[PDB]
Design an enzyme around this catalytic site. Structure first.
Site, PDB file in Angstrom:
ATOM      1  CG  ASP A  35      -1.828   1.203   1.279  1.00 50.97           C
ATOM      2  OD1 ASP A  35      -1.884   1.903   0.252  1.00 50.97           O
ATOM      3  OD2 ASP A  35      -2.473   1.415   2.340  1.00 50.97           O
ATOM      4  CB  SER A 199      -1.860  14.247 -13.662  1.00 58.14           C
ATOM      5  OG  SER A 199      -2.183  13.994 -15.020  1.00 58.14           O
TER       6      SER A 199
END
EC number: 3.4.23.22
Length: 330
Positions: A35, A199
């Site tokens: 994770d 992004s």
């Protein structure tokens, strides 16, 4: 040193991925959910409330000659999906794919919430975010990657998740045969303890690319792709019959649909998520309403590049002095 381990989807939808991890002496092998969105290595154990164990493999520290109780240490964690666990702490030897750390904090669960109990395939979590998020008190503990970093050939790990297929976590090296083209690296902020990056934009299907900054986290522990409501609406508007359902808890779409791809930017580069990766199947057994793999982050407080996005790429988690993320197509 290096390590290399195969990671395997737990079910036919890629809801999560499990990687075998050797704990203790002699080894006890548990299948952990790696994770990058959390920083605790915790396991079902011989200390877990018996009614809360339902098919998981447990760590028994009393059977490990290298286990030592970390006196006074406790831990307690709550995840973004509302699940939680807590317990006490041992140090022990932990190996992943041939790479060994001695003195790793292994957080032994005394309690786990129902969603963990109900998932017999996940024996615990292995956190790979920054150690500043580790919940052990009163002495915060380091992640497996942080403890191994100095011994690694290169201070990196990589995630290569499969679509409906096994993939690989590598530590200490970049497998140049595992991706196509070049790796594009992008800046990371550690301020929230996550592999947080920005992004450069998105496209829906064959549509034009929209240049827009989207700050989010690379999180292997989250199944879906969570993005701003504007982006998610633009995606689902391309699918006839798709709608946001408050009763189901997100966007659903007719199971008869063919989904468009979704592209996200990494600097000047582009990662394409095929449409099929965005289909999470019937909302309930036999339903013709299917659950979407791109959902709104509006209720979270952060955008999450979960498995739906990460499985479309070869992802480098670079833990150099200034951390960065790398993405390649594959």
């Amino acid at each position: 040193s290096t390590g290399s381990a195969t990671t395997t989807p737990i079910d036919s939808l890629d809801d999560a991925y499990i990687t075998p991890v050797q704990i203790g002496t002699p080894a006890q092998t548990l299948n952990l959910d790696f994770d990058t969105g959390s920083s605790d290595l915790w396991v079902f154990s011989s200390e877990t409330t018996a009614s809360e164990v339902d098919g998981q493999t447990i760590y028994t520290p009393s059977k490990s000659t290298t286990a030592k109780l970390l006196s006074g240490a406790t831990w307690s964690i709550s995840y973004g999906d509302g699940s939680s666990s807590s317990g006490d702490v041992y140090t022990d030897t932990v190996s992943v794919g041939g790479l060994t750390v001695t003195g790793q904090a292994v957080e032994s669960a005394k309690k786990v919430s129902s969603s963990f109990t109900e998932d017999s395939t996940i024996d615990g979590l292995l956190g790979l975010a920054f150690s500043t998020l580790n919940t052990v008190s009163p002495t915060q503990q380091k992640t497996f990657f942080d403890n191994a970093k100095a011994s690694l050939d290169s201070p990196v790990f990589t995630a290569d998740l499969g679509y409906h297929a096994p993939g690989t976590y590598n530590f200490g090296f970049i497998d140049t045969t595992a991706y196509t083209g070049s790796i594009t690296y992008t800046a990371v902020s550690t301020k929230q303890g996550f592999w947080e990056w920005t992004s450069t934009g998105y496209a829906v299907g064959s549509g034009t690319f929209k240049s827009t900054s989207i700050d989010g986290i690379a999180d292997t522990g989250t199944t879906l792709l969570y993005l701003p409501a504007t982006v998610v609406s633009a995606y689902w508007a391309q699918v006839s019959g798709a709608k946001s359902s408050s009763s189901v808890g997100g966007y659903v779409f007719p199971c008869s649909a063919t989904l468009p791809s979704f592209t996200f930017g990494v600097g000047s580069a582009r990662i394409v998520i095929p449409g099929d990766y965005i289909d999470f199947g019937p909302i309930s057994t036999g339903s013709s309403s299917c659950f979407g793999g791109i959902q709104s982050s509006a209720g979270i407080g952060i955008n999450i590049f979960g498995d739906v996005a990460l499985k479309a790429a070869f992802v480098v988690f670079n833990g150099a002095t200034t951390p960065t993320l790398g993405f390649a197509s594959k």
